[PDB]
């Protein structure tokens, strides 16, 4: 139900707030397989990494990416004025439970093409009250900020640029999550001809 999901919620939610939470994305079963695939790769190398989506043992990881893409397609270029004509590979990251937080950062500070951050969380039965790991985002122009749990099967969207500085509180248990960044056509273009010449 991506067409309706995209147009009725994602688009207006992102255009109005610059952040959008979509719980219960792929359902429990689908998430567990992805969870297992990520764990397998972490525990032992196949042959902080980048997954194209077609690799052996990364099939359900690829499904997530296609699903994610599908939602973006069905936004039909209504996410701001962005023309999304591609994206990064999937960053499968392991975030430790060693009492370290991540310092407030902007994902895309220097206009490198990446216009939308998209994070899928893989932390089953996660309770931030015991395990921490809260994401705090500060929408630039707003009187409020948002604490967002890294809850299992949650999909989060937000603008990668200076509109969403974000920090992550410390965690006390290992965490898994998959991040993709969706490119703006004009911005990635400008960044390419900036790195060379510019
Ligand atoms: N679960 C969990 C979970 C999820 C995110 C975080 C905090 N991470 C971030 O905001 C975050 N934001 C932007 C990032 N950009 C990165 N990039 C994108 C382009 C590459 O050259 C470097 C790499 C890691 C990032 C990164 O880790 C902590 N725990
Ligand atoms: Mn970030």
Curated annotation (Swiss-Prot):
Positions that bind Fe cation: 105, 107, 166
Effect the entry attributes to changing residue 115 to A: Little change in enzyme activity
Impact upon substituting residue 163 to H: In ECYT3; decreased interaction with HIF1A and EPAS1 and decreased enzyme activity
Domain Fe2OG dioxygenase, first and last residues per copy: 83-184
Positions that bind 2-oxoglutarate: 175
Modification S-nitrosocysteine occurs at: 13, 20, 94, 115, 118
Subcellular location per the Swiss-Prot or TrEMBL entry: Cytoplasm; Nucleus
Expression across tissues: According to PubMed:11056053, widely expressed with highest levels in skeletal muscle and heart, moderate levels in pancreas, brain (dopaminergic neurons of adult and fetal substantia nigra) and kidney, and lower levels in lung and liver. According to PubMed:12351678 widely expressed with highest levels in brain, kidney and adrenal gland. Expressed in cardiac myocytes, aortic endothelial cells and coronary artery smooth muscle. According to PubMed:12788921; expressed in adult and fetal heart, brain, liver, lung, skeletal muscle and kidney. Also expressed in placenta.
Protein's name in the database: Egl nine homolog 1
Provenance organism: Homo sapiens (Human)
Taxonomic lineage: Eukaryota, Metazoa, Chordata, Craniata, Vertebrata
First and last residues shown, out of full length: 189 to 406 of 426
């Amino acid at each position: 139900p991506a067409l309706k999901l995209a147009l009725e919620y994602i688009v207006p939610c992102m255009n109005k707030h610059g952040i959008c939470v979509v719980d219960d994305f792929l359902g429990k079963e689908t998430g567990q397989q992805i969870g297992d695939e990520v764990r397998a790769l972490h525990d032992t190398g196949k042959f902080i990494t980048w997954i194209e989506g077609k690799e052996p043992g990364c099939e359900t990881i690829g499904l997530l990416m296609s699903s994610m893409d599908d939602l973006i397609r069905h936004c039909n270029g209504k996410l701001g004025s962005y023309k999304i004509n591609g994206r990064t590979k999937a960053m499968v990251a392991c975030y430790p439970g060693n009492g370290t937080g991540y310092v407030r950062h902007v994902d895309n500070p220097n206009g490198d093409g990446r216009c939308v951050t998209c994070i899928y969380y893989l932390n089953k039965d996660w309770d931030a009250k015991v395990s921490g790991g809260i994401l705090r985002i500060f929408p630039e122009g707003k009187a409020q900020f948002a604490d967002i749990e890294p809850k299992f099967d949650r999909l989060l969207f937000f603008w990668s640029d200076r509109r969403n500085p974000h920090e992550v509180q410390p965690a006390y248990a290992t965490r898994y999550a998959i991040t993709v960044w969706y490119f703006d056509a004009d911005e990635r273009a400008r960044a390419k001809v900036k790195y060379l010449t510019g």
